[PDB]
Amino acid sequence: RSIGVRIKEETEIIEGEVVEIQIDRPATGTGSKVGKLTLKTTEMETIYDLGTKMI
Amino acid sequence: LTEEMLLKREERARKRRLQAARRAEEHKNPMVRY
Amino acid sequence: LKGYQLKGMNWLANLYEQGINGILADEMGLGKTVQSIALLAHLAERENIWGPFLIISPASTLNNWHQEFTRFVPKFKVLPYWGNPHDRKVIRRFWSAPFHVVITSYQLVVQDVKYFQRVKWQYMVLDEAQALKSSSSVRWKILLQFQCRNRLLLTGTPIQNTMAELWALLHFIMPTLFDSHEEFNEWENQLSRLHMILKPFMLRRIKKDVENELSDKIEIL
Amino acid sequence: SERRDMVADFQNRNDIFVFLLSTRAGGLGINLTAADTVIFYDSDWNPTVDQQAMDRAHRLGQTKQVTVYRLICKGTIEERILQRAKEKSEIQRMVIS
Numbered sequence: 001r002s003i004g005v006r007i008k009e010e011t012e013i014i015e016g017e018v019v020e021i022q023i024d025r026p027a028t029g030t031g032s033k034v035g036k037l038t039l040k041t042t043e044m045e046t047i048y049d050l051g052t053k054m055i
Numbered sequence: 056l057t058e059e060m061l062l063k064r065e066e067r068a069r070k071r072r073l074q075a076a077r078r079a080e081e082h083k084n085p086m087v088r089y
Numbered sequence: 090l091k092g093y094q095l096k097g098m099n100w101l102a103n104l105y106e107q108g109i110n111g112i113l114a115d116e117m118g119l120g121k122t123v124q125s126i127a128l129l130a131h132l133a134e135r136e137n138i139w140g141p142f143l144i145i146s147p148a149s150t151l152n153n154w155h156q157e158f159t160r161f162v163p164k165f166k167v168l169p170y171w172g173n174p175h176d177r178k179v180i181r182r183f184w185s186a187p188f189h190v191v192i193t194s195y196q197l198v199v200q201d202v203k204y205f206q207r208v209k210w211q212y213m214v215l216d217e218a219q220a221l222k223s224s225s226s227v228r229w230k231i232l233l234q235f236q237c238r239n240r241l242l243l244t245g246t247p248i249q250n251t252m253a254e255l256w257a258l259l260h261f262i263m264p265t266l267f268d269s270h271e272e273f274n275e276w277e278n279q280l281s282r283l284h285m286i287l288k289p290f291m292l293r294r295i296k297k298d299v300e301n302e303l304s305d306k307i308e309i310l
Numbered sequence: 311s312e313r314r315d316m317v318a319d320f321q322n323r324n325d326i327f328v329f330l331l332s333t334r335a336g337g338l339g340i341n342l343t344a345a346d347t348v349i350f351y352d353s354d355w356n357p358t359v360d361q362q363a364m365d366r367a368h369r370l371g372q373t374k375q376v377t378v379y380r381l382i383c384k385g386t387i388e389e390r391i392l393q394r395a396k397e398k399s400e401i402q403r404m405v406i407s
């Protein structure tokens with residue numbers, strides 16, 4: 001407990017205000033969900049095409 | 056009559072020039088939504 | 090063309106008038122191939138504009154050797170030669186002088202010489218000629234047997250290896266006195282004689298003709 | 311054929327950062343003046359072939375800057391190259407300079 005291992009975790013984050021979201025769901029199917037999400041800041045905004053585990 | 060003696064060359068020669076050209080230009084270049 | 094390119098061109102014209110083979114050993118980045126281009130277009134004596142010619146080159150340069158003849162003078166009938174057998178060989182059925190300059194590489198030429206000897210050339214251009222440094226090679230033993238009045242060797246600085254590889258390029262340029270190494274080792278003193286063998290058929294500059302405009306390499310170990 | 315399009319995308323674009331060459335397929339006449347800098351991850355057993363390959367970057371079209379790096383092991387074996395290169399460099403000067 002008295003030997004420290006010190007790790008820098010450096011990662012990239014997106015930090016934004018949600019403008020709109022679309023989630024698409026099959027009529028029954030195998031479950032291949034898909035969707036789009038949009039994020040804003042006081043300066044900039046953009047659209048993301050979403051992945052399956054993100055959804 | 057006399058033209059065939061030349062056609063036997065020139066019909067092939069126009070094809071040689073074209074084949075050379077087209078070679079040389081390569082050789083020088085559902086769902087619901089929420 | 091900058092004035093030094095024209096000066097080198099008239100020295101190659103003097104070797105043409107004298108019938109002498111030689112090495113274009115000016116520095117790199119100067120128009121190395123460009124100092125050969127003007128051999129066709131510069132002379133008023135007509136033959137240089139309409140003769141048959143051939144280039145041998147390292148394979149990665151089988152692109153700029155045709156692109157140069159789209160900007161320096163675009164008028165030339167230039168033929169590339171490489172590919173699968175029926176990509177390459179079939180071009181000989183089109184030209185059967187009716188087409189001027191042919192572009193080639195050493196791996197092809199050492200097999201194809203039997204076809205190339207079906208046509209005569211006025212001048213031979215041989216690029217990165219240090220490819221011929223080994224007189225033991227099948228390449229050099231065959232490349233000696235091309236037909237022209239002049240052979241011009243282009244190099245990114247020539248030789249720079251031990252005496253076993255001095256012999257081949259000098260012998261390829263001139264057979265005269267190149268019988269055996271024993272007197273040539275005698276021909277400060279020995280180096281001064283070896284310099285005066287090369288200097289009548291090799292040019293030198295140092296980069297200061299362009300380092301008026303260009304800065305150094307920053308070099309790191 | 312392949313040796314063209316990779317050069318034609320590296321020259322005349324800013325789309326790429328870096329190119330990988332062998333000392334012997336890449337070293338002759340390609341004129342990649344879009345490059346500012348060079349790294350020899352290896353030096354060759356034949357000296358000056360590295361210098362011959364450096365100059366296929368180093369030429370007049372480079373308006374910005376010029377640099378070259380060598381990466382070498384601490385004395386394990388690759389020192390024998392820098393030894394034999396500096397040793398042969400006297401001969402390789404005195405034939406032309």
Ligand SMILES: Nc1ncnc2c1ncn2[C@@H]1O[C@H](COP(=O)(O)OP(=O)(O)O)[C@@H](O)[C@H]1O
Binds near residue numbers: 372
């Ligand atoms: N018409 C021209 N106008 C300006 N510079 C030229 C011209 N023709 C050649 N050059 C110069 O040629 C240099 C490239 O030389 P290159 O053709 O690749 O021969 P080399 O192998 O000696 O480097 C370029 O930096 C370019 O500025």
